[PDB]
Coordinates of C-alpha atoms and ligand atoms in Angstrom, one line a residue:
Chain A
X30 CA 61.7 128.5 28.3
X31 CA 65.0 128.6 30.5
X32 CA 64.7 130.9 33.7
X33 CA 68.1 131.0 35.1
X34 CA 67.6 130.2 39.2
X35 CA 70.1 130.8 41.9
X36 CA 71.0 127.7 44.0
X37 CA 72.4 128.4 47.3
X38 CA 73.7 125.4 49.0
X39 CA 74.8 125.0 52.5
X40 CA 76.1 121.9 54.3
X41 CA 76.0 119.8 57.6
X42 CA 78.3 119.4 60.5
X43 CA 82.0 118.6 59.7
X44 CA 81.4 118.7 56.0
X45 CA 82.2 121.8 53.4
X46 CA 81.1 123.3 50.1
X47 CA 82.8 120.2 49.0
X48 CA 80.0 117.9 49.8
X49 CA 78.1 119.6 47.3
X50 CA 79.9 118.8 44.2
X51 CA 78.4 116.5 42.2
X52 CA 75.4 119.2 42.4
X53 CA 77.2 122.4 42.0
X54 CA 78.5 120.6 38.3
X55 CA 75.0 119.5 37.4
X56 CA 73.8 123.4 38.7
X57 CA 76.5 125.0 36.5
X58 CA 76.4 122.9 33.6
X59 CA 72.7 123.3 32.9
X60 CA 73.2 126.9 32.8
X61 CA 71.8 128.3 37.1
X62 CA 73.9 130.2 39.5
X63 CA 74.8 128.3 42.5
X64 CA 76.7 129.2 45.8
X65 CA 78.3 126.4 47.8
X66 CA 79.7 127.7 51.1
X67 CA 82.0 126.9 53.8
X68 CA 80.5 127.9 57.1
X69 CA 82.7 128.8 60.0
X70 CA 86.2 126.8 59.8
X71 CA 84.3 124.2 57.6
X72 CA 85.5 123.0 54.3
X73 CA 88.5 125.7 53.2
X74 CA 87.1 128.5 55.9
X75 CA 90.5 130.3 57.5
X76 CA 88.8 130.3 60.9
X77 CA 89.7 127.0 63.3
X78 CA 87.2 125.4 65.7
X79 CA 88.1 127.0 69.0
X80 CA 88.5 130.1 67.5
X81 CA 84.8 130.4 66.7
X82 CA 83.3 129.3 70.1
X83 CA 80.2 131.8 69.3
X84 CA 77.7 129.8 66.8
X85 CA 76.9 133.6 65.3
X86 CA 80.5 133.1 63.9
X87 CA 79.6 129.8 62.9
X88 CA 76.7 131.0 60.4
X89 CA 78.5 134.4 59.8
X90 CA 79.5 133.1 56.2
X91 CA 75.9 132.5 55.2
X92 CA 74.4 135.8 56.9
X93 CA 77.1 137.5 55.6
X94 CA 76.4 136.3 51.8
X95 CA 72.5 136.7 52.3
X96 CA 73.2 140.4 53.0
X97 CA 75.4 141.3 49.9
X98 CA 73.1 139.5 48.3
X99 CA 71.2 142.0 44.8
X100 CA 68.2 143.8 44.4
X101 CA 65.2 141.4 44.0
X102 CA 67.5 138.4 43.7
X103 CA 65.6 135.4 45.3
X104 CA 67.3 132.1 46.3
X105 CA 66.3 128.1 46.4
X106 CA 68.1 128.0 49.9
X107 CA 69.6 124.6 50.4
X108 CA 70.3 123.3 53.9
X109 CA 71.8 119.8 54.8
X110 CA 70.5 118.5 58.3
X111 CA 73.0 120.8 60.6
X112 CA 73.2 123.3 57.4
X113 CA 68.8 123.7 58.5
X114 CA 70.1 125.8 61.8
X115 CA 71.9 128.1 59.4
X116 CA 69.1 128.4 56.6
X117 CA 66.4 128.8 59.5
X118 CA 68.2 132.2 60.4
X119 CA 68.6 133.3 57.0
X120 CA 65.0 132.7 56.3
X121 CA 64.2 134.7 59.6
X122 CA 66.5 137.9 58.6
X123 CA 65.6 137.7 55.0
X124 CA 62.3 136.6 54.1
X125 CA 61.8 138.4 51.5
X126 CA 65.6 137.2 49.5
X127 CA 64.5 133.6 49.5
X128 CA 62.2 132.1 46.9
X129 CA 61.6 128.4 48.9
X130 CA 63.8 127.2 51.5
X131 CA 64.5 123.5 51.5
X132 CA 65.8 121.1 54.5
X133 CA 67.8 118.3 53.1
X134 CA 67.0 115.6 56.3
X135 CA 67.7 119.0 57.9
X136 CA 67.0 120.3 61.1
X137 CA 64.1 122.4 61.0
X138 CA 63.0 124.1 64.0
X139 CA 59.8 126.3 64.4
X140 CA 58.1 128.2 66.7
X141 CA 56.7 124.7 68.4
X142 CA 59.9 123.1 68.5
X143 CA 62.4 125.6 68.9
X144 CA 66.1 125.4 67.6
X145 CA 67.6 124.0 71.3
X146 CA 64.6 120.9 71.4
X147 CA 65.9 119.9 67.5
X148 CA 69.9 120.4 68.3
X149 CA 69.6 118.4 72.1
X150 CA 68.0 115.7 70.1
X151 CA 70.6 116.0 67.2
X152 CA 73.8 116.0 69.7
X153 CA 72.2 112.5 71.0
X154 CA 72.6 110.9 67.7
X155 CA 75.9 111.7 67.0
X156 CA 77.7 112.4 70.5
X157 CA 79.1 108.7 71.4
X158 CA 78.1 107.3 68.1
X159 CA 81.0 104.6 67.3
X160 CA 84.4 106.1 66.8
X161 CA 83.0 109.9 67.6
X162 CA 85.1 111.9 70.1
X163 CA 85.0 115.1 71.5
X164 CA 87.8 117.5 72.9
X165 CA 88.4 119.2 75.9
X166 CA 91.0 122.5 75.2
X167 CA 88.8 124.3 78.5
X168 CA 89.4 121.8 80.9
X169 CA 87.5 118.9 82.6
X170 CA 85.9 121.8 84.2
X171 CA 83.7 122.8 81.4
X172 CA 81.8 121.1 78.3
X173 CA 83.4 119.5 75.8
X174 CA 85.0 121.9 72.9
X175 CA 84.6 120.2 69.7
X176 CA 83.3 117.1 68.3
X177 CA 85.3 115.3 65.6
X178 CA 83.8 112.7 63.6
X179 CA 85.5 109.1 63.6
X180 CA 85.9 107.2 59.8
X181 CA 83.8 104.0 60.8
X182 CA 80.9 106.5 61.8
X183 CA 80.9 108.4 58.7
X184 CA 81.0 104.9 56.6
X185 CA 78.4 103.0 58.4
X186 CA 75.9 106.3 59.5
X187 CA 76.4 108.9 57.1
X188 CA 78.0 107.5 53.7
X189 CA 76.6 103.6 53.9
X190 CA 75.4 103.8 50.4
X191 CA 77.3 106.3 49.1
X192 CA 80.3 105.5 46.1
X193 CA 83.4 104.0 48.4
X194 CA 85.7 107.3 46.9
X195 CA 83.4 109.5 48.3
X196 CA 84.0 108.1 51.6
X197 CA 87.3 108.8 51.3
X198 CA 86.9 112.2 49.9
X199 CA 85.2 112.6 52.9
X200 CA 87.8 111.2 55.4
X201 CA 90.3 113.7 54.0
X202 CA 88.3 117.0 54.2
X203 CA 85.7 116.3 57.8
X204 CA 86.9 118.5 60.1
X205 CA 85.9 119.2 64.1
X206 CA 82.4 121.2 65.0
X207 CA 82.9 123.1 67.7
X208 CA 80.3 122.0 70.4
X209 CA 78.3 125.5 70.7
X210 CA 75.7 125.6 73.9
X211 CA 72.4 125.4 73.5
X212 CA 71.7 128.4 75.3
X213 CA 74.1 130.3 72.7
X214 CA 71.7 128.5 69.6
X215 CA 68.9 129.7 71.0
X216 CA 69.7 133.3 71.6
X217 CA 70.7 132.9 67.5
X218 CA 67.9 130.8 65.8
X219 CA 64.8 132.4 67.2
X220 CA 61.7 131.7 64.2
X221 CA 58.6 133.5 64.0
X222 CA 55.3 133.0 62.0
X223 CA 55.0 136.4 60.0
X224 CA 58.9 135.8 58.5
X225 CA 60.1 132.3 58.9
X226 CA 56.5 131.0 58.4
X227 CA 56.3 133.1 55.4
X228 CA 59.0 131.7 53.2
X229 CA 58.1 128.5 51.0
X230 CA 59.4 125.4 52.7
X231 CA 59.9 122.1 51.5
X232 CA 61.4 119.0 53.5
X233 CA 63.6 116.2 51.5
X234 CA 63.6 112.7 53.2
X235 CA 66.5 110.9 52.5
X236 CA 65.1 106.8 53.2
X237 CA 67.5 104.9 54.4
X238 CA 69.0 107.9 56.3
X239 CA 70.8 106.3 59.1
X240 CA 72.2 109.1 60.6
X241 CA 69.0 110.5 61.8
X242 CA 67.0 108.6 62.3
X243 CA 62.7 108.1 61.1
X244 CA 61.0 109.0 64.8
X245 CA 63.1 112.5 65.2
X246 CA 62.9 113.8 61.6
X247 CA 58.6 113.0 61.5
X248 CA 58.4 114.3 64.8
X249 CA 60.0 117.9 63.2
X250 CA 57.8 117.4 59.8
X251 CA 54.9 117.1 62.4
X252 CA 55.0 119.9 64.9
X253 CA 56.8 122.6 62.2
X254 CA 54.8 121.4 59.1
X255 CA 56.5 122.2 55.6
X256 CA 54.8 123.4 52.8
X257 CA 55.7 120.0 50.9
X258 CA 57.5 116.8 52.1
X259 CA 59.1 114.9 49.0
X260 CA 61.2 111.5 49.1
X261 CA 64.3 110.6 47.9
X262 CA 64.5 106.6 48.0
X263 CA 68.0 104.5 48.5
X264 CA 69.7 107.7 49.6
X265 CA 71.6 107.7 52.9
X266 CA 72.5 111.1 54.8
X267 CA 74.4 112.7 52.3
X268 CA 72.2 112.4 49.6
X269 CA 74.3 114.7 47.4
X270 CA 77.2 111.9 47.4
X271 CA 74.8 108.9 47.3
X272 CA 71.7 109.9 45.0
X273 CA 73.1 113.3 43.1
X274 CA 70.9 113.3 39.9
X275 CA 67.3 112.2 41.9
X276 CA 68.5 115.5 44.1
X277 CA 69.1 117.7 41.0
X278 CA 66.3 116.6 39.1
X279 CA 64.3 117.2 42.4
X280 CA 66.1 120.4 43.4
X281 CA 65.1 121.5 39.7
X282 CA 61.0 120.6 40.1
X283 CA 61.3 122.4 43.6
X284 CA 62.7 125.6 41.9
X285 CA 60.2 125.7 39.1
X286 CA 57.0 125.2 41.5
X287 CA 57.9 128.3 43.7
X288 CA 59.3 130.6 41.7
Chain B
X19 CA 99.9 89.9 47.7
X20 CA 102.1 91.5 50.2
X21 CA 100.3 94.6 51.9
X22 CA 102.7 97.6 51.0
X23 CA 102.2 101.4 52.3
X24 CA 101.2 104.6 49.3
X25 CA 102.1 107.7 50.4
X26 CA 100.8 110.5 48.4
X27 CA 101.9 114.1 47.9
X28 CA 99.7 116.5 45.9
X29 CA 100.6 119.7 43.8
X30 CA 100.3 123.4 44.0
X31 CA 96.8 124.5 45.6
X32 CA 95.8 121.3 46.3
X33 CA 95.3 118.9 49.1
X34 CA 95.0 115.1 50.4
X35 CA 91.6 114.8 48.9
X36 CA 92.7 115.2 45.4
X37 CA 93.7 111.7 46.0
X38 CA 90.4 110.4 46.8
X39 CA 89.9 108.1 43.9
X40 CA 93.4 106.6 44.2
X41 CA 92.8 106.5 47.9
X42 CA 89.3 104.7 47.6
X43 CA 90.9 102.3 45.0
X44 CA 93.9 101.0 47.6
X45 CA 92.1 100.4 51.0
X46 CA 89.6 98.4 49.3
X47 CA 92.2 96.0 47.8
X48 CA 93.9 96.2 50.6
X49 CA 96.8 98.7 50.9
X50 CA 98.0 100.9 53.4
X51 CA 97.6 104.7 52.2
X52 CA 98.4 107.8 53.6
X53 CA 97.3 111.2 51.7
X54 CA 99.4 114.1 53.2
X55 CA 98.0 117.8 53.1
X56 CA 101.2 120.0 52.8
X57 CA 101.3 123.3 54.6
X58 CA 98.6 125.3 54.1
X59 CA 97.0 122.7 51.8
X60 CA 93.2 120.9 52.4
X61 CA 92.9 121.7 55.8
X62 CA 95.9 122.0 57.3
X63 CA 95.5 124.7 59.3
X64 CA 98.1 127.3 58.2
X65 CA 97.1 129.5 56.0
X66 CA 99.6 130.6 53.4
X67 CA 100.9 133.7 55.2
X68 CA 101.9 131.7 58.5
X69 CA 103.9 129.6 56.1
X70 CA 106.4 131.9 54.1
X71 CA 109.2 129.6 54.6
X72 CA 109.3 126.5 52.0
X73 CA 110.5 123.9 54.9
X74 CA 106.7 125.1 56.3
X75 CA 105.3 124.0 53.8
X76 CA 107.0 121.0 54.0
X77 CA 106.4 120.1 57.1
X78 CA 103.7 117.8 57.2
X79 CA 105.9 115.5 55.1
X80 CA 108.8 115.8 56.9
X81 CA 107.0 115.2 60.0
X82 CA 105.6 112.3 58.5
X83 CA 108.5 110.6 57.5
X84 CA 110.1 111.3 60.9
X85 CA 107.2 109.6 62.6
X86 CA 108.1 106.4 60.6
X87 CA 109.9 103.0 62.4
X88 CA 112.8 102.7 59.5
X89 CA 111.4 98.9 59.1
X90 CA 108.2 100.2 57.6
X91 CA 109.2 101.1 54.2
X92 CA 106.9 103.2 51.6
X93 CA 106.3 104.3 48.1
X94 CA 106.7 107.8 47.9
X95 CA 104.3 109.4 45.5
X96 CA 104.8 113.0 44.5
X97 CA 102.6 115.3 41.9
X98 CA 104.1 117.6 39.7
X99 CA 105.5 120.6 42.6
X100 CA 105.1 117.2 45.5
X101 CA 108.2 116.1 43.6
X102 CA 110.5 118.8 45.4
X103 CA 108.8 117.7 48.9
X104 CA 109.4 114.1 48.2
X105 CA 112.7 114.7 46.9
X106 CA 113.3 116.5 50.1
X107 CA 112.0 113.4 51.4
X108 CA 114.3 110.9 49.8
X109 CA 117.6 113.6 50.8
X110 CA 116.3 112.7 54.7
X111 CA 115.3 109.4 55.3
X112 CA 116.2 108.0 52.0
X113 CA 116.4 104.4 54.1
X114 CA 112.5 104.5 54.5
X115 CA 111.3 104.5 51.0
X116 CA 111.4 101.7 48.9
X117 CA 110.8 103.5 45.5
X118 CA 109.8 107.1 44.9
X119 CA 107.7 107.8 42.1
X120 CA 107.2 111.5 40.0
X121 CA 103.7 111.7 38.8
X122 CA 104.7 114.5 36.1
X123 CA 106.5 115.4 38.9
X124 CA 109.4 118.2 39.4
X125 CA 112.8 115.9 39.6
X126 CA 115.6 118.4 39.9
X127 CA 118.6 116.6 40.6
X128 CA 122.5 117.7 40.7
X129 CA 121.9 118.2 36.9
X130 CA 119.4 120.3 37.6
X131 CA 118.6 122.8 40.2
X132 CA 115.5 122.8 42.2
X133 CA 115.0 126.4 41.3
X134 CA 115.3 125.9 37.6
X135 CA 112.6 123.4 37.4
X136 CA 110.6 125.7 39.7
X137 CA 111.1 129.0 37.3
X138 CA 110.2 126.6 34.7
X139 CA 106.9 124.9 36.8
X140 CA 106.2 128.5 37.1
X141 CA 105.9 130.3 33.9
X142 CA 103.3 128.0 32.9
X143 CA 100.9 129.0 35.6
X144 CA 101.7 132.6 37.0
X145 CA 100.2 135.0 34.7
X146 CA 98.0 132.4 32.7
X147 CA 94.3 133.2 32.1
X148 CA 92.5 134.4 35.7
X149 CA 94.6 133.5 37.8
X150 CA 96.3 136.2 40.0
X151 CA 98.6 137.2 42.9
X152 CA 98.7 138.8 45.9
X153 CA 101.0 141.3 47.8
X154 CA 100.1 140.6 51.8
X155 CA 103.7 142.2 51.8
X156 CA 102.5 145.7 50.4
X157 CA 103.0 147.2 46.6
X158 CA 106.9 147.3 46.3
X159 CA 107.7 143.8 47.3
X160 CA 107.3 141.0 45.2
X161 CA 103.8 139.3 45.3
X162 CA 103.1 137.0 48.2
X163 CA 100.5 133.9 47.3
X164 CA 99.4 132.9 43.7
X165 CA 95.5 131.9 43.5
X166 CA 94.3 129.7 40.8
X167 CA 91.4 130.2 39.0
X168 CA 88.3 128.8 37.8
X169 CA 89.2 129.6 34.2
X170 CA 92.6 127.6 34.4
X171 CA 91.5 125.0 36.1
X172 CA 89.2 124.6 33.5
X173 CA 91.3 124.4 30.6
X174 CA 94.8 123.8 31.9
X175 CA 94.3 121.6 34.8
X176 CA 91.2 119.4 34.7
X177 CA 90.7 119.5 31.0
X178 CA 90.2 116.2 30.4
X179 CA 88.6 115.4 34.1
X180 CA 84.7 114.4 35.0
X181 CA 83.1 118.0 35.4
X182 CA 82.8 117.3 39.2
X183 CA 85.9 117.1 39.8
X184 CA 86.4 120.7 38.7
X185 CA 83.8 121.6 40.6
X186 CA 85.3 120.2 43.8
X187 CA 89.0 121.8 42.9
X188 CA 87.0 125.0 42.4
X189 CA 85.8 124.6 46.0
X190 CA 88.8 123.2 47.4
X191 CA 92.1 124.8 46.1
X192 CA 93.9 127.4 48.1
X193 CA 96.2 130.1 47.6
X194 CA 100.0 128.8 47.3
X195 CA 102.9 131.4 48.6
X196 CA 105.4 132.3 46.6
X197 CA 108.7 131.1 47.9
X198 CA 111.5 132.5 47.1
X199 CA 114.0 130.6 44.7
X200 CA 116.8 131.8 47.2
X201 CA 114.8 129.7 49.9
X202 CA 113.9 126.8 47.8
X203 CA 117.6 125.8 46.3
X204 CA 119.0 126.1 50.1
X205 CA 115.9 124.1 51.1
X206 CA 116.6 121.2 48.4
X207 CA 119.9 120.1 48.2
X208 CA 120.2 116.7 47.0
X209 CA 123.5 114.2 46.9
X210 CA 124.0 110.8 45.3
X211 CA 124.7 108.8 48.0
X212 CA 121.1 109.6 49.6
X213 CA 118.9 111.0 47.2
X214 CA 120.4 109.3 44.4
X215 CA 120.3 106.0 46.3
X216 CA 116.7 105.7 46.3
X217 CA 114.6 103.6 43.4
X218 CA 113.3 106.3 40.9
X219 CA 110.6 106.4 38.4
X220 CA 109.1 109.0 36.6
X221 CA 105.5 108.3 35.2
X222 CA 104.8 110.8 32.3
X223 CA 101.1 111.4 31.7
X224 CA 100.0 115.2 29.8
X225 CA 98.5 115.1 26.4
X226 CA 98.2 117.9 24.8
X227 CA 100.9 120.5 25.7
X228 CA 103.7 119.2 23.9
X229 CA 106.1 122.2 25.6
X230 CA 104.9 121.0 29.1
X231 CA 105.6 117.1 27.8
X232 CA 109.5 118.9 26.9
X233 CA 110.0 120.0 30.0
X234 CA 109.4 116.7 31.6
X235 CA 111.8 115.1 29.0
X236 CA 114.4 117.3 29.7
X237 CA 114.3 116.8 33.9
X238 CA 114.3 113.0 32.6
X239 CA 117.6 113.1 30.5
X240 CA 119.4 115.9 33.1
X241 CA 118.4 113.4 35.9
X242 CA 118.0 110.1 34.4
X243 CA 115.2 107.9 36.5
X244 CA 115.5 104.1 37.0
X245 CA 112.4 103.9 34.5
X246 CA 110.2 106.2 32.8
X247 CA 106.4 104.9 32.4
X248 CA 103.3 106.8 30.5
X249 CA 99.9 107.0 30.9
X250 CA 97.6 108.0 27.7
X251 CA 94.6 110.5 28.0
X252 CA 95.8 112.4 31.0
X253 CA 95.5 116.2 32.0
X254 CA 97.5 117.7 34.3
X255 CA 95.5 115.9 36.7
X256 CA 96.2 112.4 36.3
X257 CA 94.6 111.0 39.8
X258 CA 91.0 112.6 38.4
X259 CA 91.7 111.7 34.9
X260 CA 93.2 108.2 34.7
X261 CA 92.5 107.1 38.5
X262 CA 91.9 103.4 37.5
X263 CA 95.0 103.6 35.2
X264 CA 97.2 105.6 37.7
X265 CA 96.1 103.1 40.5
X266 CA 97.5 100.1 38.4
X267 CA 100.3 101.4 37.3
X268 CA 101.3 102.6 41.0
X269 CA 101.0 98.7 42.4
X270 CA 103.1 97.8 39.3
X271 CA 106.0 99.7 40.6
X272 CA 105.6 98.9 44.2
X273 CA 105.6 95.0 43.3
X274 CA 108.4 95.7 40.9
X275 CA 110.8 97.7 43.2
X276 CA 110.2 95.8 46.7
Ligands
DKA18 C1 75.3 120.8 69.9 C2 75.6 120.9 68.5 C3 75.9 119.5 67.9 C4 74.8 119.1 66.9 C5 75.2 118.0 66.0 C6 74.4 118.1 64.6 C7 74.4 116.8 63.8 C8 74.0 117.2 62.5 C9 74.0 115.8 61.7 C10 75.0 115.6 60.7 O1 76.0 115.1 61.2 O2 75.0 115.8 59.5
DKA19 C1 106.7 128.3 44.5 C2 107.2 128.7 43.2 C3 106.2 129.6 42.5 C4 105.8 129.0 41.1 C5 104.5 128.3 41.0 C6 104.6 126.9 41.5 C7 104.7 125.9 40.3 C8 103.3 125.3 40.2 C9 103.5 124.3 39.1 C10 102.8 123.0 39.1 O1 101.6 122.8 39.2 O2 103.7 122.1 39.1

């Protein structure tokens, strides 16, 4: 019997709705709802890096969505590894909207390894990685502004075994993340037990995910334990480019068991 | 195999990334390839408002082409509304392409105007199934961006393209302003000692809209190309549709017109 679900999709750092469709075209085609959306100046957003120094602009889109969002309408909340920060928050503000959260090799922050640890060790695998750079519109006097991801470190980190096109898809449509301070994250993503810890979590392992790497994304799974951990095997970082169906099919089985 | 340099220019809400097939398809036999997001297009960073002028919106192109040591010649590939902008192009630094091609594209000519292919372009998508205007210039002046919808994309545009690739248009396409026909035949005026000097071919590919398929025989006879080619089984979205077919047909020219 066909129960009509809600996917709400929401990606990483540099990327867009975009990224998402291969999925969104298995989501609609089978009949669910789903939501890909840009967060602040990602993908076709209006707003531009440096105009959104705050990360509460940043996340605004998906706040801003959860909030509009029906009576009793619950959500299978989506978030790719940067795209975890955003979901975290929504799952802190709306518990009760969201039917199971699920962190795509996503950052997933708790109460015993708070949002700053997970992004400080996040920045370190992608600041200086290959042809990476970062800006400085402030000055050498203060941090760098925005990080903007080079084409050699998107093919050999994040889209290794992903379908060549979709490299290039990719190469036309990254665009800069504005580098927002940890102390500004914090203030933001704050996660407690009786709200956070109350929404169904599940935790998708890419395997051959060399973007971020084994040791940082157990040591997450191990001190903010999810409800389930599943697999996804040959997939790199984006999944959704590299393994779409195995994500579906498991996106699917994920909906059905907490619904 | 002599390493030549694709330059392609995409339609009407579109961007650089509707390209990405082709794209994928010429770095990896070896090509150079450059995929240009007009004004307010993928992510440039105008938005349609900031760009109410039609040489804004061609901008990135003309910048382009500026940018360009006159040695290092190009094919110039324009879709559908990119043919204005590359026949803007071809007016300016007509020296630097080597052959332009029309991908179903608008070819005015001195024939026929640049606004009377654009009326024409136009009545086939402004008031067709959802999508709709928008008067950022208040109620009594004429509507300011056209915004295509999921519904046309559907059945006018991507017809005959994998699902996905709707789906990623449907997240990806952005409002195009309405320039002003005033605007557009002062913007593209086009001689025969520069425009008409450069190599010319028109590739026609739409299957099943035989109105749409008149239209591009009339621009063809009214400004006669240096070859016409076809491509079977394609929607108005030919790079999505046909990319493997569009790619080889596209090295056929640039080997043929040197
Ligand atoms: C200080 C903010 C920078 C954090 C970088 C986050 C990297 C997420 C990984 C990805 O690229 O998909
Ligand atoms: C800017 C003139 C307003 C009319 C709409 C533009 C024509 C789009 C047609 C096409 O896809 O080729």
């Amino acid at each position: 019997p066909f129960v009509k679900k809600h996917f709400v999709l929401v990606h990483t750092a540099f990327h867009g709705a975009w990224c998402w469709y291969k999925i969104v075209a298995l989501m609609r085609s089978s009949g669910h709802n789903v939501t890909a959306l840009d967060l602040g100046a990602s993908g076709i957003n209006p707003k531009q890096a440096l105009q959104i120094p705050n990360f509460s602009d940043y996340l605004s889109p998906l706040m801003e969505f959860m909030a509009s969002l029906p009576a009793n309408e619950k959500i299978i909340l989506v978030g790719h590894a940067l795209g975890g920060l955003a979901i975290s928050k929504a799952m802190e503000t709306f518990p009760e909207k969201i039917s199971v959260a699920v962190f795509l090799s996503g950052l997933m922050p708790g109460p015993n390894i708070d949002a700053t640890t997970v992004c400080t060790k996040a920045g370190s695998a992608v600041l200086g990685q290959l042809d990476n750079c970062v800006t400085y519109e402030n000055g050498p006097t203060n941090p760098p502004t925005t990080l903007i991801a080079g084409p050699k470190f998107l093919a050999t980190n994040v889209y290794h075994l992903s379908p060549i096109e979709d490299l290039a898809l990719a190469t036309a449509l990254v665009r800069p993340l504005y580098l927002y301070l940890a102390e500004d994250i914090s203030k933001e993503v704050v996660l407690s037990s009786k709200r956070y810890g109350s929404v169904k979590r599940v935790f998708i392992v890419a395997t051959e995910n060399d973007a971020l790497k084994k040791e940082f994304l157990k040591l997450m799974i191990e001190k903010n334990p999810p409800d389930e951990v599943k697999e996804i095997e040959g997939s790199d970082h984006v999944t959704m480019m590299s393994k779409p169906q195995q994500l579906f099919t498991t996106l699917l089985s994920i909906a059905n068991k907490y619904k």
